[PDB]
Every structure is written in C-alpha cells, then in structure tokens.
Design a protein around this ligand. Structure first.
Ligand SMILES: O=C(O)CCCC[C@@H]1SC[C@@H]2NC(=O)N[C@@H]21
Ligand SMILES: O=C(O)CCCC[C@@H]1SC[C@@H]2NC(=O)N[C@@H]21
Lengths: 127, 125
C-alpha cells in the first residue's frame, strides 16, 4: 500500500508528479512527489532582506493528503547563509487553481548562539 | 559531506543518535551524505493523536542547524497531518540539546490549520 508518486500528488491537489510554485515575495520552488510520502525539489529565494538569493537550493520533505512539510538548508555551490528553513502547511484547490498556505521557521546564527525566526508564505501553483 | 562530519558538526559524535523531548517523544537521527537526515519519530505527547508508533522523518542540516518533517501516516495510525521542526543544537560537555520550534498542519475544526509549539530534545545516546 505505498502511495504511488502520482497518487501522492493527486491527494495534494495537483495533477502531475512535479509542480511549480511562486510565493508572495516571488520565491519559486518545484515540488516532486515520490515514494514513501516523499517530497523533493528545489527552492529559489527571491525575498528581499535575506541572503542566498536567485539560485536553486535542495529541498526535502514529506506529505500526506493535502498537507506538506519541507526543509531547505542554505548551502549550494554558489552561496552559503549558515541557516536552515522548514515550511509546513496545507493545499487548497479551487477551480483550476491550487494554493499552499504555510508557516515557516528559519534557524540561523544568533549573537551568542542560534535563533529561530518565523513567518508565513502562501504559494500559488504556476500553470 | 561525510555523514560522521555532518553529525559531529551538529554536535553529536555518532551518525546514529537517539533523542527525547520534554514530553517524552523520541526520535532517532541518522546523518547521511550531503546534509541529509533520516530516521523515525515516536510521538508520546499528551493531547495528540498517533501516539506510541514510529513515523519516518526526513530533513537537512547545516552546521548545528536542522530542519525535519514527519508525516503522520503509517500502518498503525493516520492523523492526516504533518509536522516540521526547525532549530539548533547546543553542546554542553557530554550533553547535547536541540532547541526547536514546530508547526503541525492538520485538518482543523472546519479547514486546514497550523498549530505551533516548541520542543527541546536531549540526547539519550
Ligand atoms: O537568509 C538566509 O539565511 C537564507 C535565505 C532564507 C530565505 C527565507 S526562507 C523563508 C522565507 N521565504 C522565502 O521565500 N524566503 C525567505
Ligand atoms: O496529532 C496529530 O495530528 C499527529 C501527532 C502530532 C504530535 C505533535 S508533533 C509536535 C509535537 N511534538 C511532539 O513530540 N508531539 C507533538
């Protein structure tokens, strides 16, 4: 009874195993549903006031039904920001549209030691 | 890039380690290649579903920072929900602590909802 990649994507609300998304600040990501409830893809940060802008970072997560969680560690061949974000949220479908409402936490280096900042991102499915 | 070096940079001198949070929930973390973490999580927190049965976790680390997710589906119980934790490790002598915040996305009273909280994990060994 392992959910197929296509069954996992359809339970999320999208017709295809891969799907591309944009948030309110214009960051983009692509999500790929796999076996074992897996989520893979990449994330492109375009939000102002943050580093590691404009290049893809690996993303990994899990999904069940219309719920999802995924993490991005901010290191790639181009730039490092010494930080990690996780998003968690839920998809809503309407007509031909899909939205993911998420909250996120971002661990980063504090003064003395680590801190966790928070926020919210809403992603829309790029048709 | 090596699993042991990734584990050591997190603060733990083993690729496989076992942790417990303030509410008795447990997890095993396995550091793999390229920042990967994999393992299992057992929820023993009062006031939640899906208690006492292991769920897969996946995530990533950089240095002493970590993020990971658990989908609340397995052969024993399904809670139709997902949690992600994000936070940082701190190492005091032989003890190591992970300070995290989490979000649990679930089917709420009448629509999806996201509940927030904080877990601190200590190394069991
Ligand atoms: O500045 C950093 O430490 C790394 C980049 C973080 C970008 C954050 S992740 C949450 C939020 N949503 C985005 O689309 N970008 C920011
Ligand atoms: O009730 C559910 O929908 C699934 C179980 C949720 C358990 C949550 S996850 C965050 C918090 N920390 C724990 O150890 N357990 C609860």
């Amino acid at each position: 009874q392992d959910m197929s990649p296509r069954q996992s994507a359809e339970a999320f609300g999208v017709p295809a195993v891969s799907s591309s998304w944009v948030n309110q600040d214009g960051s983009t990501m692509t999500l790929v549903f796999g076996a074992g409830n897996s989520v893979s893809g990449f994330y492109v940060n375009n939000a102002p006031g943050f580093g590691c802008q404009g290049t893809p970072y690996p993303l990994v997560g899990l999904t069940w039904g219309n719920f999802i969680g995924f993490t991005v560690a901010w290191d790639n061949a181009t730039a490092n920001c010494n930080s990690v974000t996780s998003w968690t949220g839920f998809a809503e479908a309407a007509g031909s549209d899909v939205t993911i409402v998420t909250d996120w936490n971002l661990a980063y280096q504090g003064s003395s030691s680590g801190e966790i900042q928070q926020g919210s991102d809403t992603f829309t499915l790029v048709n």
